[PDB]
Amino acid sequence: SDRVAQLTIGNSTITTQEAANIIVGYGEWPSYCSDSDATAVDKPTRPDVSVNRFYTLDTKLWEKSSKGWYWKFPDVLTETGVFGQNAQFHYLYRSGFCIHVQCNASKFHQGALLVAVLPEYVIGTVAGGTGTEDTHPPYKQTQPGADGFELQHPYVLDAGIPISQLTVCPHQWINLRTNNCATIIVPYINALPFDSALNHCNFGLLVVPISPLDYDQGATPVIPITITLAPMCSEFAGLRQAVTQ
Amino acid sequence: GDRVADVIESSIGDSVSRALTHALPAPTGQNTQVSSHRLDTGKVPALQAA
């Protein structure tokens, strides 16, 4: 009754029989931009059901040696469905998100994934190892698209900060013996009412194994982790031709 | 004393400068109102005569 759940939005429905409740980031639901917070004067387009629905974008294989991965929002969706088209044709964009990370195993497997949302997730480099080289991460690493990107040094989240404190951000854990999914709802987070879906990633989604996957020889060894997400209250403005970047 | 009509109905001497405009309070920038599509003949805001 807290372990069972159904998420329906648009023409898509998700079910789970081993949930661990739902986290509503920073305690607030996504909402549209008010007339006093807004600044741009054109009437926005709010496509509703054609863009606020669940999109299943990627599947990673969890292995005994996996380090963890991250995806950037709204980057992961800029090239998918009607949402992507709207993000490309418009300068301004804003929306919340319902993130549903899936991973099931068996009552004989074990392991725990930390699933968290970190706003303004700026990536850093190892500065040439010695720290004397002022290198910078390449476009494919800051905005990895739907494939996401694997963490090089998970302990410092590839940004000089402790993953041990990542739980200060909206999160859930997928502890195989307990649940098979994580559900996090995130409201729009920015210091501006609207922004570019292309130039700015509002937050990053991190999926990192803290307690390594394990099982005995003979149990299914392929344990996928799938990422499904839905925009909520999407709004777009500043219409012109489509632009991919 | 005056007597001929043109002197009586004269405006010679009017010291009050008639002003066609007046100041209004404006502490903030003007707001924007919701507007919708207009498909009219006769009404033409976009056309001007500089």
Tab-separated table of C-alpha atoms in Angstrom:
chain	number	residue	atom	x	y	z
A	1	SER	CA	0.000	0.000	0.000
A	2	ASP	CA	3.179	2.047	-0.166
A	3	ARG	CA	5.127	-0.678	-1.957
A	4	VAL	CA	2.634	-0.754	-4.807
A	5	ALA	CA	2.130	2.137	-7.235
A	6	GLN	CA	0.839	3.430	-10.551
A	7	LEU	CA	2.060	6.550	-12.351
A	8	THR	CA	-0.138	7.697	-15.203
A	9	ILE	CA	0.537	10.810	-17.234
A	10	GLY	CA	-0.269	11.510	-20.869
A	11	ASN	CA	-0.714	8.230	-22.760
A	12	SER	CA	1.747	6.406	-20.517
A	13	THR	CA	1.363	4.313	-17.358
A	14	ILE	CA	4.026	2.834	-15.063
A	15	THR	CA	3.394	0.143	-12.448
A	16	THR	CA	5.581	-1.178	-9.644
A	17	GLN	CA	4.970	-3.758	-6.944
A	18	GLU	CA	8.092	-2.981	-4.908
A	19	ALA	CA	8.278	0.779	-4.442
A	20	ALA	CA	9.573	2.791	-1.503
A	21	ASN	CA	7.163	5.701	-1.589
A	22	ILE	CA	7.766	8.817	-3.718
A	23	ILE	CA	10.051	11.793	-3.063
A	24	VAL	CA	8.826	15.282	-3.954
A	25	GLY	CA	12.018	17.303	-4.223
A	26	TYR	CA	12.423	20.194	-1.805
A	27	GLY	CA	8.875	19.529	-0.780
A	28	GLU	CA	7.137	21.149	-3.721
A	29	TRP	CA	5.230	20.129	-6.817
A	30	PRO	CA	5.958	21.430	-10.301
A	31	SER	CA	3.790	24.411	-11.244
A	32	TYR	CA	3.504	26.845	-14.144
A	33	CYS	CA	5.216	30.223	-14.004
A	34	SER	CA	3.068	32.917	-12.360
A	35	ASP	CA	2.287	36.261	-13.982
A	36	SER	CA	4.444	38.105	-11.449
A	37	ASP	CA	7.505	35.843	-11.674
A	38	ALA	CA	7.390	35.883	-15.487
A	39	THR	CA	9.172	38.532	-17.513
A	40	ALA	CA	8.948	37.537	-21.204
A	41	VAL	CA	5.776	38.998	-22.749
A	42	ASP	CA	4.739	36.522	-25.428
A	43	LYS	CA	1.928	34.075	-24.665
A	44	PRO	CA	3.583	30.681	-23.986
A	45	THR	CA	2.602	27.371	-25.556
A	46	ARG	CA	1.746	24.610	-23.075
A	47	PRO	CA	1.453	21.424	-25.259
A	48	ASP	CA	0.211	19.366	-22.294
A	49	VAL	CA	-0.248	15.613	-23.033
A	50	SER	CA	1.993	15.439	-26.096
A	51	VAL	CA	5.079	16.445	-24.086
A	52	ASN	CA	4.224	15.677	-20.447
A	53	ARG	CA	4.433	11.880	-20.637
A	54	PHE	CA	6.906	9.127	-19.808
A	55	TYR	CA	9.906	8.642	-22.077
A	56	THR	CA	12.123	5.580	-21.593
A	57	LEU	CA	15.523	6.777	-22.751
A	58	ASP	CA	18.290	4.421	-21.753
A	59	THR	CA	19.368	1.168	-20.134
A	60	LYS	CA	22.699	0.530	-18.449
A	61	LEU	CA	24.042	-2.796	-17.250
A	62	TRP	CA	24.866	-2.972	-13.575
A	63	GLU	CA	28.050	-4.925	-12.974
A	64	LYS	CA	30.085	-5.952	-9.991
A	65	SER	CA	32.616	-3.314	-11.020
A	66	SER	CA	30.320	-0.467	-12.185
A	67	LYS	CA	31.247	3.019	-11.011
A	68	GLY	CA	28.027	4.910	-11.619
A	69	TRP	CA	26.509	7.221	-14.226
A	70	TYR	CA	24.857	10.601	-14.683
A	71	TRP	CA	22.439	12.226	-17.144
A	72	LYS	CA	21.686	15.909	-17.574
A	73	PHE	CA	18.246	17.538	-17.720
A	74	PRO	CA	16.696	18.663	-19.988
A	75	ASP	CA	19.583	17.529	-22.217
A	76	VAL	CA	18.464	13.843	-22.208
A	77	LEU	CA	15.236	14.818	-23.955
A	78	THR	CA	16.198	17.632	-26.313
A	79	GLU	CA	16.091	15.262	-29.295
A	80	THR	CA	13.106	13.104	-28.375
A	81	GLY	CA	9.440	13.304	-29.344
A	82	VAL	CA	7.245	16.372	-29.345
A	83	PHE	CA	9.090	17.606	-26.269
A	84	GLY	CA	12.369	17.804	-28.174
A	85	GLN	CA	10.781	19.612	-31.087
A	86	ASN	CA	9.385	22.251	-28.749
A	87	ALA	CA	12.745	22.650	-27.022
A	88	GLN	CA	14.407	23.203	-30.375
A	89	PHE	CA	11.872	25.636	-31.870
A	90	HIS	CA	11.718	27.769	-28.727
A	91	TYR	CA	14.303	29.902	-27.005
A	92	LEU	CA	12.593	29.691	-23.606
A	93	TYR	CA	11.662	26.562	-21.696
A	94	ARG	CA	10.691	25.437	-18.209
A	95	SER	CA	9.224	22.277	-16.683
A	96	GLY	CA	9.364	19.917	-13.745
A	97	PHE	CA	10.098	16.197	-13.995
A	98	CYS	CA	8.958	12.845	-12.703
A	99	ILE	CA	11.935	10.500	-12.711
A	100	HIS	CA	11.437	6.738	-12.420
A	101	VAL	CA	14.619	4.626	-12.294
A	102	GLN	CA	14.030	0.884	-12.641
A	103	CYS	CA	16.106	-2.092	-11.534
A	104	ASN	CA	14.851	-5.504	-10.449
A	105	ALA	CA	16.816	-8.623	-9.530
A	106	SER	CA	15.983	-11.646	-7.363
A	107	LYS	CA	15.682	-12.359	-3.655
A	108	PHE	CA	19.174	-13.905	-3.964
A	109	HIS	CA	20.933	-10.868	-5.482
A	110	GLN	CA	22.094	-7.889	-3.426
A	111	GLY	CA	23.346	-4.356	-3.836
A	112	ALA	CA	22.249	-0.768	-3.405
A	113	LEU	CA	22.082	2.149	-5.819
A	114	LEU	CA	21.883	5.750	-4.645
A	115	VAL	CA	19.589	7.707	-7.011
A	116	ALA	CA	19.816	11.470	-6.606
A	117	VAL	CA	19.102	14.769	-8.286
A	118	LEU	CA	21.797	17.458	-8.086
A	119	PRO	CA	20.889	20.937	-9.432
A	120	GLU	CA	23.519	22.838	-11.416
A	121	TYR	CA	25.748	19.765	-11.631
A	122	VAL	CA	28.969	21.318	-12.933
A	123	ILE	CA	31.605	18.801	-14.051
A	124	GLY	CA	35.300	19.289	-13.336
A	125	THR	CA	38.425	17.638	-14.764
A	126	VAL	CA	41.431	16.042	-13.063
A	127	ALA	CA	43.576	19.023	-14.129
A	128	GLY	CA	46.197	16.876	-15.879
A	129	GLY	CA	46.626	14.705	-12.782
A	130	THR	CA	49.161	17.047	-11.193
A	131	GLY	CA	46.627	19.873	-10.986
A	132	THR	CA	48.764	22.271	-12.985
A	133	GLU	CA	46.851	21.948	-16.224
A	134	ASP	CA	43.641	23.999	-16.455
A	135	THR	CA	41.726	21.483	-18.605
A	136	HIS	CA	37.981	21.658	-19.145
A	137	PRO	CA	35.418	18.969	-19.824
A	138	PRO	CA	34.367	18.580	-23.486
A	139	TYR	CA	30.795	19.137	-24.692
A	140	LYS	CA	30.123	15.373	-24.883
A	141	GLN	CA	30.911	15.097	-21.176
A	142	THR	CA	28.926	18.075	-19.862
A	143	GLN	CA	25.846	17.281	-21.977
A	144	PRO	CA	26.093	13.498	-22.669
A	145	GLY	CA	22.609	13.272	-24.122
A	146	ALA	CA	20.476	10.174	-23.579
A	147	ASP	CA	23.396	7.776	-23.215
A	148	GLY	CA	24.491	9.509	-20.081
A	149	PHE	CA	28.116	9.293	-19.004
A	150	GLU	CA	30.107	7.096	-16.628
A	151	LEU	CA	31.734	8.684	-13.587
A	152	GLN	CA	35.541	8.633	-13.577
A	153	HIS	CA	35.927	9.228	-9.811
A	154	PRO	CA	32.575	8.656	-8.091
A	155	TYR	CA	33.961	9.407	-4.619
A	156	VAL	CA	34.274	13.109	-5.537
A	157	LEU	CA	31.466	13.072	-8.120
A	158	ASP	CA	33.963	14.214	-10.782
A	159	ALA	CA	33.594	17.675	-9.246
A	160	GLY	CA	35.659	17.762	-6.056
A	161	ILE	CA	32.713	17.150	-3.733
A	162	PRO	CA	31.927	14.143	-1.477
A	163	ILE	CA	29.324	11.693	-2.699
A	164	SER	CA	28.926	10.829	0.995
A	165	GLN	CA	26.923	14.062	1.320
A	166	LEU	CA	24.880	13.673	-1.865
A	167	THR	CA	21.893	12.634	0.240
A	168	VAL	CA	21.395	16.315	1.085
A	169	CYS	CA	19.735	16.307	-2.352
A	170	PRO	CA	16.375	14.736	-3.254
A	171	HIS	CA	17.076	11.024	-3.475
A	172	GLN	CA	16.006	7.431	-2.997
A	173	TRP	CA	17.935	4.171	-2.841
A	174	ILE	CA	17.314	1.009	-4.786
A	175	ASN	CA	18.287	-1.650	-2.262
A	176	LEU	CA	17.614	-4.898	-4.112
A	177	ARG	CA	16.301	-6.729	-1.044
A	178	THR	CA	13.705	-3.975	-0.613
A	179	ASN	CA	12.580	-2.168	-3.749
A	180	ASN	CA	13.070	-2.270	-7.508
A	181	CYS	CA	12.708	1.398	-8.377
A	182	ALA	CA	13.131	4.994	-7.333
A	183	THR	CA	10.652	7.777	-8.040
A	184	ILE	CA	11.583	11.430	-7.640
A	185	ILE	CA	9.472	14.423	-8.597
A	186	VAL	CA	11.396	17.619	-9.229
A	187	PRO	CA	9.988	21.149	-9.629
A	188	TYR	CA	11.631	23.678	-11.968
A	189	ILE	CA	14.866	24.849	-10.339
A	190	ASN	CA	16.629	27.986	-11.563
A	191	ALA	CA	17.248	31.621	-10.634
A	192	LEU	CA	15.269	32.692	-13.718
A	193	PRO	CA	11.609	31.983	-14.576
A	194	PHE	CA	12.482	30.405	-17.977
A	195	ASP	CA	15.780	29.485	-19.652
A	196	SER	CA	17.324	27.747	-22.673
A	197	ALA	CA	16.832	23.983	-22.769
A	198	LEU	CA	19.942	23.779	-24.911
A	199	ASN	CA	22.489	25.974	-23.168
A	200	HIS	CA	21.584	25.237	-19.571
A	201	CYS	CA	21.074	21.955	-17.729
A	202	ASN	CA	19.042	22.578	-14.601
A	203	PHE	CA	20.127	19.422	-12.822
A	204	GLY	CA	21.854	16.104	-13.153
A	205	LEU	CA	20.542	12.642	-12.315
A	206	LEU	CA	23.081	10.415	-10.596
A	207	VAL	CA	22.770	6.629	-10.261
A	208	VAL	CA	25.706	5.232	-8.292
A	209	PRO	CA	26.215	1.845	-6.688
A	210	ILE	CA	27.324	2.353	-3.067
A	211	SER	CA	26.944	-1.287	-2.053
A	212	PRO	CA	28.189	-3.411	-5.008
A	213	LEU	CA	26.036	-5.853	-6.935
A	214	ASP	CA	26.617	-9.467	-5.964
A	215	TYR	CA	25.103	-12.907	-6.562
A	216	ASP	CA	26.254	-16.525	-6.802
A	217	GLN	CA	27.383	-18.248	-10.013
A	218	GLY	CA	24.220	-19.410	-11.743
A	219	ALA	CA	21.871	-16.532	-10.969
A	220	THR	CA	20.949	-14.216	-13.881
A	221	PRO	CA	24.089	-12.019	-14.283
A	222	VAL	CA	22.580	-9.344	-16.530
A	223	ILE	CA	20.937	-6.753	-14.265
A	224	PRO	CA	19.750	-3.706	-16.278
A	225	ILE	CA	19.008	-0.257	-14.898
A	226	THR	CA	16.466	1.642	-16.983
A	227	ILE	CA	15.774	5.381	-16.953
A	228	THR	CA	12.227	6.631	-17.596
A	229	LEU	CA	11.207	10.254	-17.097
A	230	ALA	CA	8.313	12.634	-17.715
A	231	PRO	CA	8.291	16.411	-18.099
A	232	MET	CA	5.633	18.109	-15.977
A	233	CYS	CA	3.975	21.470	-16.650
A	234	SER	CA	6.137	22.145	-19.688
A	235	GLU	CA	5.999	25.710	-21.010
A	236	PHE	CA	7.790	27.177	-24.040
A	237	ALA	CA	8.147	30.703	-25.424
A	238	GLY	CA	10.240	32.751	-27.838
A	239	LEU	CA	9.367	30.916	-31.042
A	240	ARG	CA	11.586	30.868	-34.175
A	241	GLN	CA	13.269	28.207	-36.336
A	242	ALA	CA	14.449	24.904	-34.855
A	243	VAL	CA	18.000	24.916	-33.447
A	244	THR	CA	19.829	21.865	-32.053
A	245	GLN	CA	22.493	23.787	-30.138
B	1	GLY	CA	-13.588	100.938	-19.590
B	2	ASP	CA	-14.118	98.898	-22.787
B	3	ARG	CA	-16.987	98.994	-25.310
B	4	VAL	CA	-16.214	97.875	-28.912
B	5	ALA	CA	-16.943	94.186	-29.287
B	6	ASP	CA	-13.566	93.027	-30.636
B	7	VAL	CA	-11.868	94.292	-27.458
B	8	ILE	CA	-14.351	92.568	-25.145
B	9	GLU	CA	-14.066	89.224	-26.937
B	10	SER	CA	-10.270	89.515	-27.113
B	11	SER	CA	-7.832	86.884	-25.836
B	12	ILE	CA	-4.940	89.386	-25.731
B	13	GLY	CA	-3.366	89.004	-22.311
B	14	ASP	CA	-4.069	85.300	-21.597
B	15	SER	CA	-1.130	84.293	-19.336
B	16	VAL	CA	-2.154	80.684	-18.713
B	17	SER	CA	-0.297	78.501	-21.181
B	18	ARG	CA	-2.670	75.740	-22.242
B	19	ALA	CA	-0.871	72.376	-21.985
B	20	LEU	CA	-1.870	69.441	-24.217
B	21	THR	CA	-0.245	66.847	-21.951
B	22	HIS	CA	0.134	66.115	-18.240
B	23	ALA	CA	2.411	63.983	-16.055
B	24	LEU	CA	1.251	60.695	-14.555
B	25	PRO	CA	2.790	58.663	-11.767
B	26	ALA	CA	5.012	55.890	-13.162
B	27	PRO	CA	7.112	54.212	-10.420
B	28	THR	CA	7.444	50.962	-12.356
B	29	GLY	CA	7.539	49.801	-15.942
B	30	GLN	CA	4.208	49.235	-17.592
B	31	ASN	CA	2.581	45.808	-17.311
B	32	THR	CA	1.651	43.534	-20.187
B	33	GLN	CA	-1.979	42.505	-20.717
B	34	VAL	CA	-3.156	39.195	-22.115
B	35	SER	CA	-4.013	39.643	-25.802
B	36	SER	CA	-5.476	37.293	-28.360
B	37	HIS	CA	-5.691	37.093	-32.137
B	38	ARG	CA	-7.505	39.870	-33.982
B	39	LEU	CA	-8.625	39.347	-37.597
B	40	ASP	CA	-10.259	42.725	-38.336
B	41	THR	CA	-10.728	45.200	-41.168
B	42	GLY	CA	-10.689	48.878	-40.148
B	43	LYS	CA	-8.554	48.314	-37.033
B	44	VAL	CA	-4.887	48.736	-37.966
B	45	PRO	CA	-2.418	49.462	-35.042
B	46	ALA	CA	0.690	48.481	-36.976
B	47	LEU	CA	0.266	51.181	-39.628
B	48	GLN	CA	1.634	54.630	-38.745
B	49	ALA	CA	2.431	57.987	-40.347
B	50	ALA	CA	5.804	59.133	-39.055
